């Protein structure tokens, strides 16, 4: 149970069809530093880590991107979800030379080092759910932030 | 089961640098946190630090920050630790252990649950 | 940072009695990362609790973990000649992760 992580409403969001990685990143992060979840230039570190180490994941159907940082750099726990119009690529985060077409993305800051399994348990555990990544395509800010804190409070 | 090979004892001078690795085997190898654990002769426990190897999210203690390089080959299920600069103080018996898992063959506890044989650097000359 | 002080630092008991043995904290941790260690001379050490209370697989209901904040405790009540060993508590709520000096019961 990935518990001791923040989740508010405007941590939701839906990006239009223009945005690349690194304003994909830019707006995922931007509710996380208002919040003081984060340090002020989160989004900088987080851009550079995905380009030594990528986060993205080709999981059938719907492609899911995990962008983080360092807990060096995070103050409080939370998650900030990301749903994408056009699909997005994402390098290969099992180092295939592949790209994976991203619509979900799912930011994750974390403090504690210890917790990141859990964090990523519970993410492996919702992209595997065929039923749950479809809806999440289809339903709105206000619809996937139910969705989603219901699932996070397990 | 989760068993963990580490590689065999080492005899190095003054200012060298050692690798020892850890053969993982048994679970998952990339979804999960493979710590280095210390133990000088008769001293107890100091924990080094650590890797997630699925995204090489790597973690340093602050006093082994520098001279430690902790790494994970995921293509052989294998994790490594390099210290450099050695020196007297640093003779010991060095492990490396795997987070657990809740209930039988589930989500991960944080504490070790499974560790090596051990690795016996010893520096001397 | 997070400095864990054992007590006592060496006990000696009889089969069959209750050996308590405490785990302070210098700051407070959070109850879900706690962990309780055995380590017999010659062995790695085995994982006997995980996050304060829960115990792991495979160890006995005599070894109970308990407490939260800054004040920790191992109880062992029904001691046999294979729980002679030194026990440490580790905290893994913050990087770097700390352990205590160690407890050899007797």
């Known amino acids: 149970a990935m518990q001791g992580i923040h989740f508010r409403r405007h941590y939701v969001r839906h990006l239009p069809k223009e945005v690349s990685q690194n304003d994909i990143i830019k707006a995922l992060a931007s509710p996380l530093i208002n919040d003081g979840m984060v340090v002020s230039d989160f989004a900088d570190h987080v851009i550079t880590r995905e380009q030594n180490f990528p986060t993205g994941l080709p999981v059938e159907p719907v492609g899911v991107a995990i962008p983080h940082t360092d807990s060096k750099y995070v103050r409080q726990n939370a998650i900030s979800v990301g749903i994408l119009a056009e699909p997005v690529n994402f390098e290969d985060a099992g180092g295939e030379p592949d790209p994976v077409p991203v619509r979900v993305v799912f930011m994750l800051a974390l403090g504690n080092w210890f917790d990141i399994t859990n964090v990523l348990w519970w993410i492996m555990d919702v992209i595997q759910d065929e039923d749950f990544m479809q809806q999440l395509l289809v339903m709105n800010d206000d619809e996937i932030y139910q969705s989603i804190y219901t699932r996070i409070s397990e | 089961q989760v068993q963990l090979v580490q590689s065999g004892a080492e005899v190095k001078k003054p200012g060298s640098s050692v690798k020892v690795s850890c053969k993982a085997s048994?679970?998952?190898?990339?979804?999960?946190?493979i710590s280095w654990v210390r133990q000088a002769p008769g001293q107890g426990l100091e924990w080094m630090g650590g890797?997630?190897?699925?995204?090489?999210?790597?973690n340093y203690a602050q006093k082994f920050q520098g001279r430690v390089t902790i790494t994970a080959d995921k293509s052989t299920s294998t994790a490594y630790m390099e210290l450099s600069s050695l020196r007297s103080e640093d003779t010991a018996v060095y492990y490396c252990?795997?987070?657990?898992?809740?209930?039988?063959?589930?989500?991960?506890?944080?504490?070790?649950?499974?560790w090596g044989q051990g690795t016996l650097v010893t520096v001397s000359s | 940072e997070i400095v864990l002080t054992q007590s006592p630092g060496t006990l000696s008991l009889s089969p069959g009695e209750r050996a308590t043995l405490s785990c302070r904290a210098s700051?407070?941790?959070?109850?879900?990362?706690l962990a309780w260690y055995q380590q017999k001379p010659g062995q790695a050490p085995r994982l006997l609790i995980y996050?304060?209370?829960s115990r792991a697989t495979g160890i006995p209901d005599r070894f109970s973990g308990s407490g939260s904040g800054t004040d920790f405790t191992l109880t062992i009540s029904r001691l046999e000649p294979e729980d002679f060993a030194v026990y440490y508590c580790?905290?893994?709520?913050?990087?770097?992760?700390?352990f205590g000096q160690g407890t050899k019961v007797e």
């Open positions: 252990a795997r987070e657990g898992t809740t209930g039988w063959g589930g989500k991960p506890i944080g504490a070790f649950a499974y």
């Open positions: 048994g679970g998952t190898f990339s979804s999960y946190a």
């Open positions: 890797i997630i190897p699925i995204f090489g999210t790597a």
């Open positions: 700051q407070s941790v959070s109850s879900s990362y």
């Open positions: 996050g304060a209370s």
């Open positions: 580790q905290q893994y709520g913050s990087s770097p992760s700390t």
